[PDB]
Every structure is written in structure tokens, then in C-alpha cells.
């Protein structure tokens, strides 16, 4: 698509953050909807800045909504007089999921930019993935004759910082993140991060097959062509050829393991020749 | 006063009828520009924004102390789709609430020249829903008022409840032009 | 490797001695403060 | 704007005292800008000639 | 007279502006670091503005580098030697 | 009513996100923009946000605050939640520290004028490092009172000597024209946690395993590699068998160290070949086909 | 600041009794609550030598995110300690040589509060090299302990009395010395001579 | 704690830093570089600058003030001397010279053999010679031929002229002429040609000039 | 561990400790004196630390 | 029809279902390679399809309970692994 990926920077997150505060010491709120600003690197997003708009909606109905887009192009201006090279790419809303009236707001947006994109920002502290999901406007043309409609096509999020971003970033976060830890462990631990993300995943995907089977949801048959995909690329891990390549593969990777740990024994035995004489060396002189 | 107004401009398909002269939606076009220009001599903070009420709401301008920018907005909308009045009332509170400052009183220019398609309940807890935030709209019953004199009435009288002109219920029969009706009704006065 | 490296055994040396002195930093002291009070004026 | 003028021109007067360096202009760029070498032998690079016409000047 | 005072308020707005060093681009080390050559001087490693293009920083590139931080203000074309100008500019007399 | 010495600025850190990237983005040019807060008491002075003012063209200094732009962007923030007075002024140092100039105190002497208590805070965006930015708060000292032999602020307490100045800071005037006021932050649960989602990988590239073709290819570089590392190790504990206690480290300079190279590939290769197989391992059991 | 003192001193003496309280304002995120959960286990495990309370203050005092709360459960150590004078110079001995400036001071003040009034030789010989500290604050609460530990003593009691009595002197007649650890000598200078040498400190 | 000091101690590198050249090692941590300013300093070095890269006539970043020794430049970095470029390489041939067999087989024997062969030539026991020196009438092809070898050639081309080291900046000859041998070194196989060369090499000094 | 910490924070402030000038010794005098060339800047008379 | 551990089906068993001769059906194997209907490949010296991939086809509901139960088992075991990882490497986890 237009998007390949969405880069939000952390000040997007604290901006959006405060922001939902700010607003929700009012007591009565669902979502606060934003403005995003960042620049275009090749086919990769670069939202970078945010600025809050006011917005309302109704609880009941989704059809009433109001954004004002006036305020929006002033503050358009105030921040483009600020910094230049920051466009409107898109918007960002805190509801922890989409919403019906998504499409309406982002057709309203795609005036201001063309190719906008909605960045869903969750406030709440997910414990596994990212606080947020980026999605564009796309024509979804359908092949069983319905009359084609706007939906929203997911685009991969990462959270990435800018120099000075990041040295900020990691003032605040000096007493919290510890870096002691070596890199086999961080390796490990995003094994097992990845191990649970893709149970929750599998989760979402069980909860709902088991709401279509009772009937809560319709089939949709293509949810049901993804999974018939998804199910016939679990590869066999018993076939003969496949074992053999991993004992193999396995075997290639343990003899370096060994010739690294021998390496490893020989330079600390050096290090205790190196401390027992300087030791006796020391005792010797005192 | 120092209150703020949102106009409930109407620019469904019977506004092309020439029952106004010349036509329904420059008659609009006038009458708007004859209020808002009201509202803003009356007090130079007043703020004024239109809202359109065509097939889907679509909030063309916010509030704003500028009138020109009222005209170049109504100077392109074009008559199309069908009155959708439930909406937008609503979406004219959503704006009212949003407004620059708080201290402004509520007001609704309401435009009904199309017959609104709903049930008398709805308008009923729609007027006591705008009445409980003190929200006051004007309605100008032109064009089809021969269907909507019923549904407006009650509008109006639970939204004024039984004490005080907050909103009133101007009904212009057709003639030369609604504009030379509204400065002397009671929304300009 | 694990077994060398609990092997390996450091004298109870006066620990934190290697650091500033306390006159030869006093000294630093000194020296800034006419800096400070020569340069700026 | 005559009290305007005038402190403007006193501002001017604090900061044309004396002394000055004595330069040498070098080139004439266009982005109406000066590059210059002073007395000190260090070469310079001024947005803005200052006061003095940017047509007075030559290389 | 209002073009007086513009002309006046324009010197005030010159006041303020400080000239910038003359360097030559030695080396771009990183996204945000190079090394230059003062014109007669030392040379520094420096940071670039970042609305610079830092396309048009090829190593050789004359530059005006900030006072205080040195960081590379702009680019400039190649200078012409007051000598040079004045040999160019020189009138042979319409011989 | 002298101020106290205990003073403290809070900055939260959406307020200090901005000022840095804010001075970042403006390098070299001292950047300047306004803090919203709110004097919480004679001791407190919190920064909630911050908001930058655009630059009216050239020059590395402060420029003139520009009224028309401060009133339109507070009386547009107070319109989304964000009715917060201004408590001061921030700018961008980059690279010479952090204190104020001629121009800064004048600057700060608007502000003054205007709140009494409004604080002029300096950071240093090229001096900062990750986990201690370059940041500094400043008021003016009167020269009045100072002169006729009084101290600028009352000391109630050990608070406000906790941070030594540096010198480049005392030669621009601190604690002359200008006091240093400590700086605090205000962390909360909800941002941390919402920071700490930098870098953090996504759930896909955990269980993903490197190409096998590029990983045999590493592997065999960094053995090949070692092999003469190994041969220069042994040649290097022959040498040091030999050498003075004065060389141990002066010997050792300009000229590669087999024993830490040696190190560093089997850190390497450790890490890489233990990752990749237990990732294998994993993916055998999770990706099945029965 | 104040409601720190006052929780902590509501539950003075209690043993146990505070645990529920205490929990509460260690795992608190106000790093001032936090402090007051410190001063708590100093209150309520006031000279019982409880190394449950010791082992928590330790494990604040080397891994906490405020520095005042370091501070003050290395300071909350004498309180539990002054009934065994001889061990703070022990457990304490290291956090003064930490590279947290407010541990160290906090491992002074402990020295001081625990040994206050013994004369405490091993103490005043951990404080003698704090006094030198680069941190000013750290030498002003060295010297304010060193008053405490040796108050009334004698040259013949402590060696090392008349050394810190001429480095009282010498720091407060410093001009280039820091003004704070101006503060601390002369603090400690009424503290050595205080009541008209006649008085003491002892918690117990 | 090690980790957040080992991550803020790399503040004494922030920009802007003066450049000087790595003179001596003193002692582990101290060292006696030669700035570009154009005084020789006895500094500290920092603790985290890897000792591997200090080798001699090495370019250093120094701070601004105090010119500690706080980072290493990578050895092709800072060099006022460029290497030719594929579009700056000559246009002449080996064939456009005509009638320079001899001259053409000893340059080849003596600069663009020793480049491909050098095991050969350490097989064999000759000792390839450092650098050859083109001299006679002028006119002769001397420049041509040197352009010939730049055309011809796999390795890089550094073309200098003596006269461009002699500069005003006190210092800078020297430094430029160390900084051009640092670049061939860092880009072997290379070829170093200094026409004219009596612009730096004449056998008569006069020390009070 | 704590005095490797230590010594690393205390390097940063040594680090901004300004240089020191070489210079070649022409010849000692007397009351600890020394006469030395700094390497740009001409000569000096010096005088000698107490180490 | 056929599970994934047995998608190899013998020249016989499609000339059989599809009523075309033997030596027909690697022609009719080709068109559906062409066309994009499965993927695989054919190992005529064995007279067999391997066949690897198929188009998705409409699912009754019955067959999405039972895709769902693959989904449950599935998700024991990653559960199963996720713990085991955890349980093994505890101390080094961070
Ligand atoms: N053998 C040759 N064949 C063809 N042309 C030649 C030959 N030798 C010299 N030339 C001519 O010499 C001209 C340039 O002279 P060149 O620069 O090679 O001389 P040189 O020895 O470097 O002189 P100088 O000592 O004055 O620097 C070229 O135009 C080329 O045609
Ligand atoms: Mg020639
Ligand atoms: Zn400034």
C-alpha cells in the first residue's frame, strides 16, 4: 500500500497520554481524538508530533459526531510556523478499539492529507503489545458482488525515537529499565514475549471461531480463508528430511557453542594465572 | 447578549423549489446572512458557525467571530439529499459545547423547509434533552410547515417549558422572501 | 569456566585510595574559584 | 515614530562604538550577503552586511 | 519619512545577527557529525543544522559554521580570491 | 518574603520530551517557548506542558516573544483541557551549558515583570546523554538587593545546595545576576510504562529465526576469525611472559588485544548459536502439524 | 516533609505492630511516603536490633529511585542499632564508601545517631575520612555525627577528640570551604560543648 | 549504577571537538597528542576509548576545553587530500604514450607489480622498492606516464603536488602530508604521486626563514 | 565494583581539568625554578611541583 | 479431503474420482498448477501428486467448530512451551 510503516515517536505517546488526562478530569469521556504530525521517509511513516482537537460524539447514535476542523487548520498553522517539515499524516483517537464512525473521521481527515493514517492509541498499559495500532483507508473490493465499501487495512506500528527523544526517554526511564541484563537473556525473554504474544493471538482467533459457532457472529468467509491458509502452513516437523536437516543444522551450531565454551575456559583459567600471581606477587612485596 | 449561535441551514432537495424568491436556498442565503450579521452587531464577542442538514450532518463552519467566511461557506452548498433533523440538532449541541468560550449562552438557528420524518417521541426527549443544558433553538417553519406545525409545536413549547421566550417557533408562510419575515420575528429582536 | 572464575580471589586492598585526594582536589577548588572570579571580570 | 527612529539610532550608537576590527571584504554572495577577512586573519560569513550598503562594497 | 524608519528598523534587525565562520568540509562522519577545516585554523568535528540538505556537504565544500557551536550554518559556493576578482575585473582601456 | 532556597520546578515529562526535541530541532539556534504550569505554593513550581514559539528568522539568540502567538496558542489550549498560566520560559543551550546570557536576563526579566515567580529554564540538547540531560532553572537576582548586602534567597534548608554549579555556569553569572533553582520530574505509572514500549520488539521477531545460509556464513567468518586470534594469543602470553610491569598497558596500546577479541567472538557466537537453536527448539513444538 | 515524621512517630515502639503500616508506605510510589516508611521501621523497632527491620532498610538503602529515601533508611539504621553501639560501625562501614553521596551521609548520620554519647573509637575512625568527603554535605553530616558520638568526651576517653575539635575550628575559619559544611561544624561544635559540657545524648 | 556511568560519562564527547594527533601513550590513562590548533597537550584519555585504535599518527577528537583525549576518528577521516575518483581518473593510455618501453616495464616493476605480486616478490627475495622517483627533461612523459598508471590501475590514486603542502597555517604542511600517507595506508593497495617534488624537497634550509 | 563506579563518575570532572602544556627543559636555576620552551609559545621560567 | 500428513495422492486415486484415464491426469494436474487452484508437484517415475496447498473453500459450520478445536489444541501447546520457558530459565529471565 501507501503505507509500509508507522514510526510513532514517544512524544506522540505522552502528548496523547496527557491529553486523555487532561480531558478525562472532566469525569464523563469515552476517547479523545487528536491530530498527528510527522514527515515522509521512502514508503515509512515518521509521526512525530500530535496536537489535541475538540471532539465529541454520542453514546448511543455514531452517526453524531463532532470534530472541529477549524480548530484543527489553526493549530495546522501555529505548529507548521514551529516546524515546517511536520505535515498532517493522520489522526489518533484513545478508544482501546475502533469505532463505527472511524470512517467518517478519517474522511473528514483526508482532506487535510490524502493518504491519512489513524493511529489508535491505547492509554490503558497493554502488558504485551504495542499502545499503538496504525491503520489507512482502503477501497475493499469485494469479489462476492457486494458494492464495494472503506475499510480500515491494519499497517505494522513500531515505536521509534529521535536522538534527543531518546536520551530524554531514557532519563526518565533510568530508575525502571535495566540494562544489566545480557543479551542472551534479552533474546530469550523475547522468546518467550513472542511465545505469548502468539498465544493471545491464537486466544483471539479461538474466541472467535467460538462466537461464530454459537452463532454471536456471521461467518464472514474470509476470516475462514485466512485460517484454512494459516492451518495448511504449520509445517510437519516429523518427516525424515526435515529431522535429519535439524540434527544436523543443530550439531553445526552445537560444535561452535563448543569451540566458544572451550575458548571461554581457557581465557578464565588465564584470568586466575593473571590473579593468583598478582596476589602472590603482592603478598610478596608486603 | 453574549451568546453563541450555530445556523441549521437546510440544503435538501426541496430547497430548490421557488416557493422563496427567487429560490428557496438563495432565500436561505439571505435570511442566514441577515442573522448572522444580527448576531454579530448585537454583541461583538457573539460567535456564529454554520452546521448543514443535508442527508448526512456535516459541520461546514465552527463558531467564529467572522461573518464573510458564513457567506463564502453558503455560497457552495448545493441542495441535495434528504432532511436528517434528529442529527442535527445533536450535532449542533456537540458544537455549542465545544465553543471558544464557556461563558456564551446556548442558541440554535434551526431552517426546517423539508417535513421531519420522525416519530413525536424523539423530538420530545430531544427538546428536553437540549432544555436540561439549557439550550435554546430557533425555528424558522418555512417551506412544508402545513406537515411540520404539529411536531415543531411541541419542539418548542417542551423546550420553552411554561415559563420564559427562550426559543421560538417563527413560522413564515411563503411569499416574497422569508429574510423581510425574520426582522420581524422575534429571533432578531 | 564457573569454577576458574570463583577461583579468583582479590586482596583486601584499601579500596576507594586510587580515587581524587582530598588536598590535590581541594586544590581544583581553589584554582576555579579565581577562575571564575578572574575570567568574568 | 520619530522616538522610535531616534532610540533605534542610539542602539546603533552603543553598538558602533569604537573600537573596530579592521576587515577586508572578500566576496559578495547573494543569499546581499558578505564574507569577509579580518585583520586577525580569520575569514567570516555575515547573513547580513550590516550597516553599509551592500552596493558600497567590493572585493 | 516611513521609508526612513524602515531603513532604520532594518539596520536594528541587522544589529543582532552574528557572522559565522568559514570552514571547509572535511569528512562527514555520521548523519549528524562532520569534520571541517577552518580556513586558517584548527579543524573541528561539528554537528549540521538539521534543515540543511547535507546532500550539498561533499568533502572540500566551503561552509559558515555557528561562532559558539561551530555547527555547519550553510553551504556556500566556491570563494573567488579578491586578487582573482580584480585580475577578472580589470579595464584593458578598449584597445 | 525572601524565596526560599528549597524551591523545586517539576517538569513532567511530556514538558521535557518537548523542550529537548524542541532544542534538538533548533540547533544551533537558542529556541525558545513558553511553560505551562502552576504555582503550586512558594516551594512548587510544576510544569505541566510546554509549548515552542516559532522562530522569527536568523540568528542564534532569543528572540522577542511574540504576544500574538502566545495569546492565540493558550486561548486555543484552553479550549482542549489545557487551561494552564504560563509559569515561564524554556530555550535551547546547544553545547555551551547551561546558564543565561545578557540577552536571557533581559528576557526573563519580562516574565518577572509580568509573574514575579515565572522561571527561565535552560537545557542543554547537545550536552545531554542518555539517562542525565543538561537542565538548568534560573531567576533573577535583584541587583538592588544583592548589592546593599543581602542574600538573594533564604537557605531554610540543605535542599538548594545539593547540586554544585558548574563553572561554566558561575562565569556566565550564576549565583550573581541569576540563581539555580532545583530541578525535579514527575514520573507517573501510567507514562512510564508507556515509554517503556520504545524499542520493545514486537512478538514476531521473538520466535523468528535468522536465515540459516547468513548464519552458517557468521559462524564460519568469527571461527575463521578466531583461529587467528588464537595464533596471535599464543604469541601474546609469550610476550607478556616476558614484559615489564611498565608495558603491561603502554605496550598494549595501538596494537589489537588477541585475549579481548578472543572474547568478544564467543560472547558473539555464544549469543547467536544459543539464540537461534532455542528458537528452533521452540518453533518445532509451537508451529506443529498434528 | 511533615506528615513523614508524624506517621513514623505515631507508631514509635510497636514492634510488629506497624508491619501493616509499613508495607503500605515502603510499596507507596511518593518517594516522601516512602521516606516515612523508613522513619516508621526506625520507630517502631527503636533499639531492638530486629535484623528483619535492618535487612529492609538495607535493601532500600541500595536499591531505591529517590535518593532521599537511601538517605534515610541508612539513617533509620541507628535507631535500630544504638543498643549494640558495636555493630553499626560494621553494617554500615561500606554504604560509607558507596558512590551515592547520600548514602554516605546517611551511613554518617547512622554512625552518629547508633554511637551518639559512646565515643565510639571504630565510628569516629569511619567518620575521620568522611570529614574530607568531595560532597560538602557529606562532610557536614560527618561532622555533625562525629559531635554526637564523642559528645563530652575527654582526650583521655577518645584520642581523637581534640583532632575534630581543631577541625571544627579550621572548617568554620575556611573561607574557601563550602558554607554548608561551615553548617555542619559549627552544628557540631554546639553539639561537643552542648549543656555546658554536663549533658549527653543516649536513647537509652 | 556502573552501566548509567559508563552511559553519562559520553557527555565529554558531545560536539563540537577539536581535532589533534595521537603523539605518544605516557601512561594508561594520559597521553601527549598534538592538536590542530597547533600545540602539543599532556592530557588525560578516556577511560571507555578503545586503546586498540591509538596507534601513532592517529587522528583524535579532543574536547573543545580541556583537550582530553575523548574519542579515536576513523584513520580515512580527516584528510584535507582526496583519493581520485572513477570520474577524475586521466584519459591516457598505455598506447596514447608512445616509445617509453623502458620506463614503462621499470614503473610496472617497481609500482603496479609489487601491488599484485608482492608474495612473489617476497618468494623470490627482492625487496620491492618504497617509492620511485620519475625524473628528467621536461616534456619527457614523466606526468603522462603517471597519469597512465592512474588509468591503469586497481589500486587507489592519490595525486598531489608539492607545492599544495606548503601553507600558511603553521602546521598544517606537515600534517597534510601525514594525513595523505594515513590514507594510503588505510586504502592498500595505493599509489602516492607527488609531482614536482623539489617544492618540498631542495637540499637547502634556511632556519631563520 | 563501587570503586570502579566511583572512579568512572569522577572521570568525567577530571576530564574537563584543562591539559597540560610540553615544553623542553633548557636548564634548571635555582629555587626550584626551570627554564622551558613550550612547544608554540616561546619560553618560560617555571616553577617545580613539590612531587 | 485428505490431511496434510497424506496429501500424496496416486495417479489411480484421480484418474479414478475425475473418470479420466491414467495417463491423462498429470495433464489435468498441470491446468490445476496453472491455473493457481493447489500447488505441489508431480513425481511421475511413482505415478503421485504431492500435493501442498489448496484453495480455500467455504466451511460449514461444523468444520469451524472443528477448526476451532485444532486452534485449542494449538493453543495448549503454545501455552505448554510458553511455561516451560519460563519455568527453565527464571533466574536469566529479566
Ligand atoms: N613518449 C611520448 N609519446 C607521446 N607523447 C609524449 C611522450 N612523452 C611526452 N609526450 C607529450 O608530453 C606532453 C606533456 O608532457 P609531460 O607532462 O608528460 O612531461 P613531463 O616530463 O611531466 O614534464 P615537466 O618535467 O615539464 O613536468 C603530452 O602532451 C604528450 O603528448
Ligand atoms: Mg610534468
Ligand atoms: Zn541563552
Redesign the pocket.
Given at each position: 500500500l501507501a503505507v509500509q510503516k508507522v514510526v510513532v515517536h514517544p512524544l506522540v505517546l505522552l502528548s496523547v497520554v496527557d491529553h486523555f488526562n487532561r480531558i478525562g478530569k472532566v469525569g464523563n469521556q469515552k476517547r479523545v481524538v487528536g491530530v498527528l504530525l510527522g514527515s515522509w521517509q521512502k514508503k515509512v511513516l515518521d509521526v512525530s508530533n500530535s496536537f489535541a482537537v475538540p471532539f465529541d460524539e454520542d453514546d448511543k447514535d455514531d452517526s453524531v459526531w463532532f470534530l472541529d476542523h477549524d480548530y484543527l487548520e489553526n493549530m495546522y498553522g501555529m505548529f507548521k510556523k514551529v516546524n515546517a517539515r511536520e505535515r498532517i499524516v493522520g489522526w489518533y483517537h484513545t478508544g482501546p478499539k475502533l469505532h463505527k464512525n472511524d470512517i467518517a473521521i478519517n474522511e473528514l481527515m483526508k482532506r487535510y492529507c490524502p493518504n491519512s493514517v489513524l493511529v489508535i492509541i491505547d492509554v490503558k498499559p497493554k502488558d504485551l503489545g504495542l499502545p499503538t495500532e496504525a491503520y489507512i483507508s482502503v477501497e475493499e473490493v469485494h469479489d462476492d458482488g457486494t458494492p464495494t465499501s472503506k475499510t480500515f487495512e491494519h499497517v505494522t506500528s513500531e515505536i521509534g525515537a529521535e536522538e534527543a527523544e531518546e536520551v530524554g526517554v531514557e532519563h526518565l526511564l533510568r530508575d525502571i529499565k535495566d540494562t544489566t541484563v545480557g543479551t542472551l537473556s534479552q533474546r530469550i525473554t523475547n522468546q518467550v514475549h513472542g511465545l505469548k504474544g502468539l498465544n493471545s493471538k491464537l486466544l483471539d482467533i479461538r474466541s472467535y471461531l467460538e462466537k461464530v459457532a454459537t452463532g454471536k457472529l456471521p461467518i464472514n468467509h474470509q476470516i475462514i480463508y485466512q485460517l484454512q491458509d494459516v492451518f495448511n502452513l504449520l509445517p510437519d516437523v516429523s518427516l525424515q528430511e526435515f529431522v535429519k536437516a535439524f540434527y544436523l543444522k543443530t550439531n553445526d551450531q552445537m560444535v561452535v557453542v563448543y569451540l566458544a565454551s572451550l575458548i571461554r575456559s581457557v581465557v578464565a583459567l588465564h584470568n586466575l594465572i593473571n590473579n593468583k600471581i598478582a596476589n602472590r606477587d603482592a603478598e610478596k612485596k608486603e | 447578549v453574549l451568546e453563541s449561535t450555530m445556523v441549521c441551514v437546510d440544503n435538501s432537495e426541496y430547497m430548490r423549489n421557488g416557493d422563496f424568491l427567487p429560490t428557496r436556498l438563495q432565500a436561505q442565503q439571505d435570511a442566514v446572512n441577515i442573522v448572522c450579521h444580527s448576531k454579530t452587531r448585537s454583541n461583538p464577542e457573539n460567535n456564529v458557525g454554520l452546521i448543514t442538514l443535508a442527508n448526512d450532518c456535516e459541520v461546514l463552519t465552527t463558531l467564529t467571530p467572522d461573518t464573510g467566511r458564513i457567506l463564502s461557506k453558503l455560497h457552495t452548498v448545493q441542495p441535495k439529499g434528504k432532511i436528517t433533523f434528529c442529527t442535527g440538532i445533536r450535532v449542533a449541541h456537540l458544537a455549542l459545547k465545544h465553543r471558544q468560550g464557556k461563558n456564551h449562552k446556548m442558541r440554535i438557528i434551526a431552517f426546517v423547509g423539508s417535513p421531519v420524518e420522525d416519530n413525536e417521541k424523539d423530538l420530545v426527549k430531544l427538546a428536553k434533552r437540549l432544555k436540561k443544558e439549557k439550550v435554546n433553538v430557533d425555528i424558522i417553519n418555512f417551506g412544508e410547515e402545513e406537515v411540520n406545525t404539529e411536531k415543531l409545536t411541541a419542539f418548542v413549547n417542551t423546550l420553552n417549558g411554561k415559563d420564559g421566550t427562550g426559543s421560538h417557533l417563527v413560522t413564515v408562510p411563503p411569499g416574497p422572501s422569508l429574510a423581510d419575515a425574520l426582522i420581524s420575528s422575534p429571533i432578531l429582536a | 569456566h564457573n569454577m576458574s572464575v570463583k577461583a579468583m580471589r582479590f586482596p583486601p586492598k584499601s579500596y576507594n585510595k586510587d580515587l581524587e585526594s582530598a588536598e590535590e582536589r581541594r586544590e581544583r577548588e581553589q584554582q576555579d574559584l579565581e577562575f571564575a572570579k578572574e575570567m568574568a571580570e | 515614530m520619530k522616538d522610535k527612529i531616534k532610540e533605534n539610532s542610539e542602539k546603533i550608537k552603543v553598538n558602533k562604538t569604537l573600537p573596530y576590527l579592521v576587515s577586508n571584504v572578500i566576496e559578495l554572495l547573494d543569499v546581499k550577503c558578505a564574507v569577509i577577512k579580518t585583520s586577525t586573519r580569520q575569514t567570516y560569513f555575515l547573513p547580513v552586511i550590516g550597516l553599509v550598503d551592500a552596493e558600497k562594497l567590493k572585493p | 519619512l516611513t521609508k526612513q524608519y524602515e531603513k532604520s528598523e532594518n539596520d536594528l534587525k541587522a544589529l543582532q545577527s552574528v557572522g559565522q565562520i568559514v570552514g571547509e568540509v572535511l569528512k562527514q562522519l555520521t548523519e549528524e557529525k562532520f569534520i571541517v577545516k577552518a580556513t586558517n585554523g584548527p579543524r573541528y568535528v561539528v554537528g549540521c543544522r538539521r534543515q540543511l540538505d547535507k546532500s550539498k556537504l561533499k568533502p572540500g565544500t566551503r561552509v559558515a559554521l555557528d561562532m559558539t557551536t561551530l555547527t555547519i550554518m550553510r553551504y556556500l559556493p566556491r570563494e573567488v580570491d579578491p586578487l582573482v576578482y580584480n585580475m577578472s575585473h580589470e579595464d584593458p582601456g578598449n584597445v | 518574603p525572601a524565596v526560599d532556597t528549597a524551591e523545586q520546578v517539576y517538569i513532567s515529562s511530556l514538558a521535557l520530551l518537548k523542550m529537548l526535541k524542541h532544542g534538538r530541532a533548533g540547533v544551533p539556534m537558542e529556541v525558545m517557548g513558553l511553560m505551562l504550569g502552576e504555582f503550586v505554593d512558594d516551594y512548587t513550581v510544576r510544569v505541566i506542558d510546554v509549548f515552542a514559539m516559532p522562530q522569527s528568522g536568523t540568528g542564534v539568540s532569543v528572540e522577542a516573544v511574540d504576544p500574538v502567538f502566545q495569546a492565540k496558542m493558550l486561548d486555543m489550549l484552553k479550549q482542549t483541557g489545557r487551561p494552564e498560566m504560563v509559569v515561564g520560559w524554556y530555550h535551547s543551550h546547544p553545547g555551551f551549558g547551561c546558564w543565561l546570557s545578557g540577552v536571557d536576563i533581559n528576557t526573563q526579566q519580562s516574565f518577572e515583570a509580568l509573574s514575579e515567580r515565572a522561571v527561565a529554564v535552560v537545557v542543554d540538547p547537545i550536552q545531554s546523554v542518555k539517562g542525565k540531560v543538561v537542565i538548568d532553572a534560573f531567576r533573577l537576582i535583584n541587583a538592588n538587593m544583592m548589592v546593599l548586602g543581602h542574600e538573594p534567597r533564604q537557605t531554610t534548608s540543605n535542599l538548594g545546595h545539593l547540586n554544585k554549579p558548574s563553572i561554566q555556569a558561575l562565569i556566565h553569572g550564576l549565583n550573581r545576576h541569576y540563581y539555580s533553582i532545583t530541578i525535579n520530574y514527575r514520573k507517573n505509572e501510567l507514562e512510564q510504562k508507556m515509554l517503556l514500549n520504545l524499542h520493545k520488539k514486537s512478538w514476531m521477531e521473538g520466535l523468528t529465526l535468522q536465515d540459516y545460509s547468513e548464519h552458517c556464513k557468521h559462524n564460519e567468518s568469527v571461527v575463521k576469525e578466531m583461529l587467528e586470534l588464537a595464533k596471535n594469543y599464543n604469541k601474546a602470553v609469550e610476550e607478556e611472559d616476558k614484559m615489564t610491569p611498565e608495558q603491561l598497558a603502554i605496550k598494549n596500546v595501538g596494537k589489537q588485544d588477541p585475549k579481548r577479541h578472543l572474547e568478544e567472538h564467543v560472547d558473539v557466537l555464544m549469543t547467536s548459536n544459543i539464540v537461534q537453536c532455542l528458537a528452533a527448539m521452540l518453533d518445532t513444538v509451537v508451529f506443529k502439524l498434528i | 516533609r511533615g506528615l513523614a515524621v508524624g506517621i513514623a512517630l505515631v507508631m514509635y515502639g510497636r514492634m510488629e505492630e506497624a508491619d501493616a503500616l509499613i508495607e503500605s508506605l515502603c510499596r507507596d510510589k511518593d518517594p516522601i511516603l516512602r521516606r516515612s516508611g523508613m522513619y516508621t521501621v526506625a520507630m517502631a523497632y527503636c533499639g531492638s536490633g530486629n535484623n528483619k527491620a535492618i535487612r529492609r532498610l538495607l535493601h532500600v538503602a541500595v536499591s531505591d529511585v529517590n535518593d532521599d529515601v537511601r538517605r534515610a533508611a541508612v539513617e533509620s539504621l541507628g535507631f535500630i542499632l544504638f543498643r549494640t553501639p558495636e555493630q553499626c560501625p560494621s553494617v554500615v562501614s561500606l554504604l560509607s564508601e558507596s558512590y551515592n553521596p547520600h548514602v554516605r551521609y546517611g551511613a554518617a548520620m547512622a554512625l552518629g545517631i547508633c554511637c551518639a554519647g559512646t565515643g565510639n573509637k571504630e565510628a569516629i575512625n569511619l567518620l575521620e575520612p568522611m570529614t574530607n568527603d568531595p560532597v560538602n554535605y557529606v562532610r557536614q553530616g560527618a561532622l555533625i555525627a562525629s559531635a554526637l558520638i564523642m559528645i563530652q568526651q575527654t582526650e583521655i576517653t577518645c584520642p581523637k577528640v581534640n583532632q575534630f575539635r581543631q577541625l571544627y575550628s579550621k572548617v568554620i575559619n575556611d573561607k574557601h570551604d563550602d558554607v554548608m559544611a561551615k553548617f555542619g561544624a559549627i552544628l557540631a561544635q554546639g553539639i561537643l560543648d552542648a549543656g555546658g559540657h554536663n549533658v549527653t545524648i543516649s536513647l537509652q | 549504577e556502573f552501566l548509567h556511568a559508563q552511559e553519562e560519562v559520553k557527555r565529554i564527547q558531545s560536539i563540537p571537538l577539536v581535532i589533534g594527533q595521537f603523539l605518544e601513550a605516557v601512561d594508561q590513562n594520559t597521553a601527549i597528542v598534538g592538536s590542530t590548533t597547533g600545540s602539543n597537550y599532556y592530557v588525560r584519555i578516556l577511560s571507555t576509548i578503545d586503546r586498540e585504535l591509538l596507534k601513532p599518527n592517529a587522528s583524535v577528537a579532543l574536547h573543545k576545553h580541556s583537550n582530553a583525549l575523548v574519542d579515536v576518528l576513523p584513520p580515512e577521516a580527516d584528510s584535507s587530500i582526496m583519493m581520485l575518483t572513477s570520474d577524475q581518473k586521466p584519459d591516457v593510455m598505455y598506447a ?5 618501453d623502458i620506463q614503462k616495464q621499470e614503473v610496472r616493476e617497481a609500482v603496479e607489480l609489487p601491488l599484485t605480486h608482492f608474495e612473489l616478490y617476497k618468494q623470490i627475495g627482492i625487496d620491492p622498492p618504497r617509492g620511485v622517483l620519475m625524473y ?10 603517471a597519469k597512465a598508471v592512474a588509468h591503469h590501475t586497481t589500486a587507489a590514486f592519490i595525486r598531489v603536488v608539492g607545492s599544495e603542502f606548503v601553507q600558511k597555517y603553521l602546521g598544517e604542511g606537515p600534517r597534510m602530508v601525514r594525513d595523505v600517507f594515513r590514507l594510503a595506508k588505510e586504502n592498500a593497495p595505493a599509489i602516492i604521486f607527488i609531482?614536482?617534488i623539489d617544492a618540498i624537497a631542495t637540499k637547502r634550509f634556511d632556519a631563520q626563514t | 565494583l563501587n570503586a570502579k563506579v566511583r572512579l568512572l563518575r569522577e572521570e568525567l570532572q577530571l576530564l574537563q581539568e584543562q591539559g597540560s602544556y610540553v615544553g623542553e627543559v633548557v636548564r634548571a636555576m635555582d629555587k626550584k625554578k626551570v627554564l622551558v620552551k613550550v612547544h608554540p609559545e616561546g619560553k618560560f621560567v617555571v616553577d617545580v611541583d613539590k612531587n | 479431503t485428505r490431511p496434510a500428513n497424506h496429501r500424496q495422492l496416486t495417479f489411480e486415486e484421480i484418474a479414478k474420482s475425475a473418470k479420466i484415464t491414467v495417463n491423462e491426469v498429470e495433464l489435468l494436474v498441470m491446468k490445476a498448477l496453472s491455473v493457481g487452484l493447489v500447488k505441489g508437484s508431480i513425481d511421475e517415475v511413482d505415478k503421485r501428486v504431492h500435493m501442498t496447498w489448496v484453495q480455500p473453500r467455504v466451511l460449514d459450520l461444523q468444520q469451524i467448530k472443528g477448526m476451532k478445536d485444532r486452534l485449542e489444541f494449538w493453543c495448549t501447546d503454545v501455552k505448554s512451551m510458553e511455561m516451560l520457558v519460563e519455568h527453565q530459565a527464571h533466574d536469566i529471565l529479566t
Open positions: - | - | - | - | - | - | - | 596514447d604514450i608512445g616509445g617509453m628528467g627533461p621536461p616534456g619527457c612523459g614523466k606526468t603522462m606516464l609531482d614536482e | - | -
